[PDB]
């Protein structure tokens, strides 16, 4: 029951009531043994911004997944071009402070991210509910039924959280070590 976004937006806005569930019935607790309704601090008690929290978590997990993949892969293969060669930028963490500025690439990526995020800012502020959350209508290969949708949502959430933590210890493991994909000493 994905509730196609056109009819899903009918219940958008900042919901003022409380569903009585965990964080507004969001998929994601869904642990191995039972449900890990984590929320120790209590941000989910702030029920009206629970969809905001889900949107933030999904965006962070997606950016993470991409970033972990994008500091794992370049340590093996680089983009054709002298500025990206293994000799011009010896390490992947150097790639940030290697192009920047007037070299072009990183500034272009920042510019396009800014454009695509400004264009999708109307999705976060307004047109954001419990069900929509991170739904940017890129479903396509989103399986039908209902439990399959829950399984794919929890897969996305677990992979995103795992990638956030992994990227954290990865940029950390590379600054203190300066090594390829296995960032052990």
């Amino acid at each position: 029951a994905r509730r196609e976004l056109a009819v899903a937006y009918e219940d958008a806005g900042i919901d003022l009531m409380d569903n009585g569930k965990f964080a507004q019935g969001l998929v994601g607790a869904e642990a191995a043994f039972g449900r890990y309704e984590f929320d120790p601090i209590g941000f989910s008690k702030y029920t009206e911004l629970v969809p905001w929290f889900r949107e933030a978590e999904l965006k962070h997990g997606r950016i993470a997944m991409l970033a972990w993949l994008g500091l794992v892969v370049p340590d093996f293969v680089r983009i054709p071009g002298e500025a990206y060669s293994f000799e011009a930028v010896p390490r992947v963490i150097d790639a940030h402070d290697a192009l920047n500025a007037d070299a072009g690439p990183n500034f272009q990526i920042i510019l396009f991210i800014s454009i695509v995020e400004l264009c999708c800012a109307k999705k976060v502020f307004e047109w954001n509910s419990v069900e929509t959350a991170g739904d940017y209508n890129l479903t396509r290969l989103f399986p039908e039924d209902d439990e399959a949708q829950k399984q794919m949502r929890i897969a996305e959430l677990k992979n995103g959280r795992l990638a956030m933590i992994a990227f954290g210890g990865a940029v950390t493991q590379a600054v203190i070590t300066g090594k390829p994909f296995p960032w052990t000493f």
């Binding site: 937006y9 009918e10 219940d11 958008a12 806005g13 307004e126 047109w127």
Partner: protein, 70 residues
């Protein structure tokens, strides 16, 4: 207008239901007749007259420096 908002407000009433896809133009609802009326004010009209006179004197002084033709 139960929410206290100032007179001449382009703000929609903040007491709305779930997110509304509505058009709320934030630009002053000015009027061409009103703008012409405002630019015809005694302060505006006479300051414009003073600016025109001063600039005319400036140009006369520039193209005819000093009183050479006295």
């Amino acid at each position: 207008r139960k929410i206290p908002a100032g007179p001449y407000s382009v703000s929609v009433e903040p007491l709305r239901d779930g997110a509304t896809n509505e058009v709320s133009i934030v630009t002053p609802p000015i009027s061409s007749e009103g703008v012409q009326e405002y630019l015809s004010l005694a302060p505006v009209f006479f300051m414009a007259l003073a600016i025109f006179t001063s600039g005319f004197a400036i140009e006369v002084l520039r193209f005819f420096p000093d009183t050479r033709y006295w």
